[PDB]
Each structure stands twice: as structure tokens, then as C-alpha cells.
Amino acid sequence: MKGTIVGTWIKTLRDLYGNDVVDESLKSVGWEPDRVITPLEDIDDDEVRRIFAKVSEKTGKNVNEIWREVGRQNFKTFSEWFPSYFAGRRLVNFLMMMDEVHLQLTKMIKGATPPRLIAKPVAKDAIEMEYVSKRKMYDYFLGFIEGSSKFFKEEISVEEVERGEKDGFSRLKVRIKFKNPVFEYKKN
């Protein structure tokens, strides 16, 4: 996992559960509690997993619930640190651009393998987005979408319609519905 994202996870964990929970969790995997994570270094996926398991242990929270909360709050943490990607006007266009943004990172950044996020308009007020990953971060994905709403200041409802694993991939399709319409039909 790239330092960019893991660094935001560590800060977000602190904002949610405080410095002691985090310091101990990092110490438990052999990090300095005050480790400065750089954007382009690589962090072992399993060390992140063990860190989050420690947070779970020390907070009595299910890890999936932690990931859900981290997702929501991390949208803020991440958008503040990497603003270039979060300056658009409309949530819907942001969401539609995400598959290409991730694809560009896969292409151009060594060691980066973000998930597919193919989005598809399905109604004048809704899009379908499908998370497809070799990882499985269903709850983080859900929380991050929810965090995007608070940032663009646009109300949405997020409805999960499909979940499952096939051929090595975790897959989660959500239907994102906007209070106010965002598409109109146009002749082919």
C-alpha cells in the first residue's frame, strides 16, 4: 500500500480514537509511534491489517466498523492533503472520474494498485458505482463514498445492491441517488 493513503489512515485513526490507541497499535507492529510516512514509500498490507486489529482490540470495536468510520473521516483527511483531485464543482462528475483517476495511478505510480470504480448513470438522479478489487475493503469503500457527500456538500443516499467474490476479485455495486437530478436524457 502506498504511503499516501496509509499516512492518511494513521492521522484519521488519531482523530477518531486518539493518540494512545494509535501509538500502541503502531508500536505493536514495530513502528515508531511518531513515524513520518512519506507519500511514495510502500507499506506492507499485512502491517496495516495488524495495526487495525490492534485498534479494534483496544476500542472494542469490530474492525469492519472501524473501517466504515475511517472511510467517512478519511475523505476529509485525504482531500486536505491531496487537494488537486478534489477541486471539481459537482460530486457526480467527481464520482464518474474516479475510475480513470485510479487507473492513472496504477499506470504511473510504482507499487500502486487502487481498485476499479466503474460508474454508470442509471436514472436522472442516480449512478451505479462498482468497486472491484483484489483487496476487500467493502466498509472503507462505503464510508469514503459517504465522506465525499459531506465534502461536496451534496446530499445522497447510498444503497448497496450487489456484493460477492468472483475469480479472485471482491465486488460491491452501490446505487448512489442524489436529492436533486443530475442527468437528462439526450438522443443518441
Which residues in this chain contact ligand HEM in the complex, by CB under 6 A? 1-2, 4-5, 82, 85, 98, 101-102, 105, 112-115, 117, 133, 135, 137, 140-141, 144-145, 148
Residue number, 76 or 102, with CB nearest to ligand HEM: 102
Residue 129 CB, nearest approach to ligand HEM (Å): 7
Residue 10 CB, nearest approach to ligand HEM (Å): 14
175 labeled part of a ligand binding site? no
153 labeled part of a ligand binding site? no
Q: How many CB atoms lie within 10 A of CB 54?
A: 19
Residue 59 CB, nearest approach to ligand HEM (Å): 21
Give the residue ranges of the annotated binding site for heme b.
2, 78, 102, 113, 131, 133, 135
